Symmetry: D2
Subunit: 427 residues, 4 copies
């Protein structure tokens, strides 16, 4: 149990006895969930190891390609390793994707053509994808809508599960629909992420209407949450970011897609241009970090999830509503806390900032950010800028004052920040 020396050290952070008791109770309560996670982690570590070994990765794959990067074996074998991990025909892993949204956008523009319609089946996509699609606003930035590609949407049911009957009806009534988009993570929605079994039910439902419909999954935040990925239950294409789970906290930028050879090649032509695709693109010497990040990903992903589960339990014990609960099956690393008080939300986030190794001294306050209307507060202090796998928090400043917390390179770090933050509002 916690050392007396550690207790004294935490007192210098103003962590009080009431918070320590809540922590001891929460740790005791969540032990069985941690064991479930360790069983999954064990399988995923083996899965990833096997993929490296099947590709015969060697020292020589730590390339330092320049120029066109023709024949960069490090890049080509990393794609192969990912495709093995995800059990897909192909993959496309590049530092050139600037963020996860870029990878998703490349998938969409890559696989859609004028006259086609895409169908999002988990309600409204996260905000940044809205400009990519041209859902509401269009200002000639060149959205899907501006290239004659249409958008439709089926919301999740009241219970948070996909509306399979409506999905079928919408597909049957519109034969122009060639792509179904499934967001795995909840985003800022007060509901559960979709479980792998839910993604399967969706794909089976879609494929039963027209087998040729491409089932695309935004896999961000869901890597290594289960022993299966969406590609193990019928997904034709998935996309994600290398500064979230799959980079293991160390890939410095980039993104990935895994799926059928056709979907990947089509995506590659949007990443670069038709006729080039993924054949060109040197990797700036960062390929070693991308291999290593993948190898560490199953473990680091669970450190962060463990942080989320402790957060869920401890905040519940402190009297705050939380989503998800500590014992629910999770499909992402995000934890939401309803403070129901603006000041508590602000102080909690400030606490998280002070618990960061980087920029721990920085002003953490509400600010107006481009196109949000409501102010936003963000705690971030990472080794890799914008990394979601490193402890961070964000919240719109509006009723009922919900904060979203994610990451933690280690469970001990996430725990420490959580204790600092909670001590700012519970004493």
């Amino acid at each position: 149990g916690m050392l007396e020396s550690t207790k004294q050290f935490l007192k210098k952070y103003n962590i009080n006895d009431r918070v320590l008791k809540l922590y001891e109770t929460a740790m005791n309560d969540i032990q069985n969930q941690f064991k479930i996670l360790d069983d999954i982690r064990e399988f995923n570590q083996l899965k990833v190891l096997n993929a490296f070994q099947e590709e015969r990765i060697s020292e020589a794959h730590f390339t330092n390609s320049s120029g066109y990067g023709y024949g960069d074996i490090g890049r080509d074998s990393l794609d192969a390793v990912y495709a093995r991990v995800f059990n897909t025909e192909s993959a496309l892993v590049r530092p050139h994707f600037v963020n996860g949204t870029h990878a998703l956008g490349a998938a969409l523009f890559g696989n859609l053509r004028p006259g086609n319609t895409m169908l999002s089946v988990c309600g409204e996509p996260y905000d940044t994808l809205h400009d990519v699609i041209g859902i509401t606003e269009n200002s000639n930035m060149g959205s899907l809508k501006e290239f004659g590609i249409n958008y439709k949407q089926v919301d999740l049911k009241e219970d948070g599960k996909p509306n399979l009957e409506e999905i079928e009806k919408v597909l049957k009534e519109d034969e122009s629909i060639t792509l179904v988009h499934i967001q795995r993570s909840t985003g800022y929605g007060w509901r559960r992420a979709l479980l792998i079994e839910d993604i399967k039910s969706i794909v089976d439902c879609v494929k039963n209407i027209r087998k040729d419909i491409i089932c695309f999954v935004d896999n961000c935040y869901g890597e290594f949450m289960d022993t299966k990925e969406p590609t193990d239950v019928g997904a034709d294409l998935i996309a994600g970011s290398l500064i979230k789970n799959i980079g293991g906290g160390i890939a410095p930028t980039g993104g990935y897609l895994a799926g059928t050879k056709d979907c990947i090649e089509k995506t590659s032509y949007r990443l670069t241009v038709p006729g080039i695709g993924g054949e060109c693109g040197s990797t700036f010497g960062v390929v070693r970090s991308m291999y290593q990040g993948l190898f560490l990903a199953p473990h680091i992903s669970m450190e962060a999830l463990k942080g989320a589960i402790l957060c869920s339990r401890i905040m519940e014990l402190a009297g705050f509503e939380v989503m998800p609960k500590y014992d629910e099956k999770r499909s992402d690393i995000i934890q939401s806390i309803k403070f129901n008080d603006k000041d508590k939300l602000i102080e909690f986030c400030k606490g998280i900032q002070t618990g960061s190794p980087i920029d721990s001294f920085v002003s953490c306050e509400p600010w107006d950010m481009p196109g949000y209307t409501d102010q936003v507060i963000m705690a971030a202090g990472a080794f890799i800028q914008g990394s979601s796998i490193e402890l961070s928090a964000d919240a719109p400043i509006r009723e009922p004052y919900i904060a979203y917390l994610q990451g933690g390179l280690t469970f001990d770090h996430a725990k420490i920040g959580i204790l600092i933050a909670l001590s700012r509002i519970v004493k």
Copy 2:
């Protein structure tokens, strides 16, 4: 003049006295042209220095940049430096462009929309752009044509200059034309590159028909050939590769665009996606090389060009037809030599290969890529055109295209090694 020690050293590369006499004559003949280049180089060096200074570039700009790269001053200031050099509202310089074709394609998809038509006014664009446009064939890769964007073409007059009369006709007769594509370099052809004055006449001509038509120039190989760039004579947007002239021999990958804020932003949305544009994108630890490459570019571009000029004159003196001539105004660093003999063309390329610092020893032979191609290449940066290289499709009349040379001495050495394999 050439030291006796150098001559004896060159003898070890089988360089003979006949080749040395041709070299001597060529050097005498091309000195006035070198002086002309030096006057341009001096101005361009100042222009680039001033762009750095106006942007107050400092050591702090050689930033460690990771993740999203939100607020990356290294990247942001480099865009501002390029905008100053080219005298444009904005610029987009990124290591994320995998090659020059990506930069050009990004400009075209970025600035065209369904129903618009683009017009290429220097005949058909270089080959790799054909799949991007969807010119001849289409296999659902997502070409401009597959997104409802149309393509038209006006060829250069038989004298190599723009057909202004036909451009006007085609524009007046098709109001759906919203962009005019101008290729500055010659490509695998046999004509002069377009001079800045020629570019200006095309722009003035086009804007006189409809002032809203975007005039886009593929500037590859043309950087620092003149004291003006196409953006100085009305181009709305230009694109290029950082492993050609503008990288100064040291930028390791990437491309650039310079132009109006609207055109540059639209391009950025194709580079990434609508709503992100150029706001995200870390620079991978290579930003210092990109800045330093720019600073050296005016100088290095002329080392390569002097190489081309010497090549032109010595091969002319050797008895071959060369394009362009040693004393013509140039708008690119490429030199063509017509061998009228397959073996002489092959040997020459093998000579260039053996004159490279990297992969000097590698077999240089024709390979399949309709006709076979042969390429001499041995560079620090893979595929760099500013480093000494040669390529030639194997077909009548056996024309080779030579370009690059980090230093004039290196280009010279390669030329003398190559010519010695055929003039004995």
Copy 3:
């Protein structure tokens, strides 16, 4: 517990039921030791976090210095962070150290002068240090001995503890002794690493004869094994390698020293030259990885230690003699196994090679090492070449056939490797 999917996947590596039974028993036995390690890790994570926060580390410290490296705040602050972690006046952390031996040699040549004598109090130091000192070979390479600096040695007692009485006797009789060398880790010794309390007893004993005697500790493999470091119990100077524990699996090269300002400055003059010391030395843009490595070090060190503890117990249960035993206090991450059979030793190492992500397919056979009459066999397949914190094994091919196993970026990886290896010798 272990999923059925995991058991079937492991069956593909020829892992058998007897090995899985041994495994389940060993996991049951070691859970209390793992909890003790978690308590120490929690403290150390906080210690490192605190060191970052006190130095107000920001993204601005992730420098990309060039040339002379004058005023490189990234490098300077990293030294300050390490000094806080080790509670020393100063520290010298540089990528310029090519390995741990270099760092140790810099300390010795830095702090010794003609006529001085150094005393190693833990028996003979590991082999690579012999040429530095000039113990056996003196071929004008410029050893301490070739510079007029003498060497004396005091072996450990039969029980493996320091011979305090003999240390005093030798120090009293030889007033030229100005530095005492203490090796924390064991080497080829079938004995335990020295505990922090043992190091304290040596320092107390030495300072009580002459307070000015420099007490120097080779800290390799010992970082974060305890909540205290040798500098917390009076060591004047310590040295280590960044591709061992303290680089957290991600530092790409380099070494560190931490200690009094005088000792560190004197070391810096050997690293470079007198009058320059640590004032020049750009850091190639690898400083971020060094900071992140340190931050992950408390956690990664314990992933490796958990693999060593598992190895100890499962091998003991398999019938092999092991050093240390699963429940002894540890001062390093190394686990020794006495096979008493050349073939089993070789098969075990082959197994570890087949469980690596990198070079899993390369032949692992004994080979002739320059200047040694016993062949050596080594299993190695790392992201960072030569890293001791990634799973690896090595053995000199001699009776009684003892292998040394260390590393494991994640406990799951070390575990997988051990299971693959044991299955090659226990059916």
Copy 4:
């Protein structure tokens, strides 16, 4: 000639007609001196190309080694290329040398042992070497003197030439002298740099007394000034900085030595430790820039020298004493200007900073630079910090107020900077 647009652009830097006319006159006067330089540059370019080709350099040599760097072909082949360029048995080219003083000091400590005496034959060495040797001051930093290695000095003659008769007398009278140190460049003096023929005369003289005396040359700033290097006229060992000539303006840090295998090995054991030497040492991903820099060095070295010659003649015409004159044979890239006025001096250096691409707005001032007695002002607006192959100027603050100008990646840049600087003092 200069374009009118260029003249108008220059007027925006407050460059006046008097300075432009001085420039025009100077260029006319020095043109013939440049022809000589191009003949040398041509040979040197071929010399370097040949060395690359003999070593069969390929893209495979652009290594990205990590950890120990064992078996790094990029590093090993670069040493071989250097050795061919300098016509020596061996070479040691490493990013690990922090500056040129480090490389020189490693040579001396590497090759001298207690009882040996070194003899500097060009008068007092460059400032930063005084602490390395222990000439005057000794504060237990570990100078040669503190390790029992003695120092003697023979000054140059009043005419600046080597005093061969005195060298002979000193060597004959002291058989403990085992190394002769020869400085090629003048440092902060007022004399001409030693030509290759002067270096030969010293080597022949020394070897005629005792063939076993190591002839060591500090080659900084002299690389590619002639078709020969000191190793072509009998030097056993030479050393220099990769941020001066031989780095070609792109090597980011480091040093080199070239010479006999025995002298290079002995230096390597000081750079690291005995028993390791040059066998360990990963190269931080910068090896490609070191190869590329060497290839550009013959050219860039002459761009800087053309700048020095222009500076000589334009300042002479302006009315200042200069050393050397525009038409003297040069053995380094440095140009000295005696202002005999502290104000004109600091103003000139400030002009140079304002003529630089990087940090043009920083107003440079005198500072306590590591390794110097008095305060020196340095103009150093560079891509690589402290690089003196990039346009720079430095000047100890003391009578007669001599400024030392060197560098220029292009002659056009050196020209522009000289005009900017002179315009601040001449109107």
